[PDB]
């Protein structure tokens, strides 16, 4: 009935959902932690407050994880090509979104941590901006869930 290769696209969706989100998170944490160290050498007392951007990178990673496992749950043998491509769409949607969100969170985090290091008044600005990036990851996750649960 259904073609034998149909599962490949769903598998690719799951793998992408994990991987692109993971890469975005990795970039974000790397940039953020670099900025954290740079601020740290001068301002030891700001580490706990400053870590936040890495936390939001963790959030984007978690978004990737939830979407990926959700697709894995739907990866059934008799998967129709329709469902398989729905899962691929979910994959890309969350994945590229998360990669972009990771870039944004990382760069904003580095800039903000350095700014805070000199100007404590900016910290609230940091957080306020960063949320507008993380909501992008929320957006990708939302659409991916809608697709996977079509």
């Amino acid at each position: 009935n259904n073609p034998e290769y149909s599962s490949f696209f769903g598998v690719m969706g799951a793998s992408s959902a994990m991987v692109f989100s993971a890469m975005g998170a990795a970039y974000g944490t790397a940039k953020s932690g670099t900025g954290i160290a740079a601020m740290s050498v001068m301002r030891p007392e700001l580490i706990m407050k400053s870590i936040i951007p890495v936390v939001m990178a963790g959030i984007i990673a978690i978004y990737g994880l939830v979407v990926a496992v959700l697709i894995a749950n739907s990866l059934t043998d008799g998967i129709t090509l329709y469902r398989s491509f729905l899962q691929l769409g979910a994959g890309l949607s969350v994945g590229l979104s998360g990669l972009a969100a990771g870039f944004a969170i990382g760069i904003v985090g580095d800039a903000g941590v350095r700014g805070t290091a000199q100007q404590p008044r900016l910290f609230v600005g940091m957080i306020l901006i960063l949320i507008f990036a993380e909501v992008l990851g929320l957006y990708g996750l939302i659409v991916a869930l809608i697709l996977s649960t079509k």
């Binding site: 949607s93 590229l96 979104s97 972009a100 904003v108 507008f132 992008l136």
Partner: peptide
């Protein structure tokens, strides 16, 4: 489905790219 995935994802890419450029 590539269409939809790009529809969301490219939009998010633009959003995030511009976001950090101005941030």
């Amino acid at each position: 489905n590539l269409g939809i995935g790009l529809a969301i994802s490219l939009s998010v890419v633009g959003a995030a790219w511009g976001i950090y450029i101005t941030g």
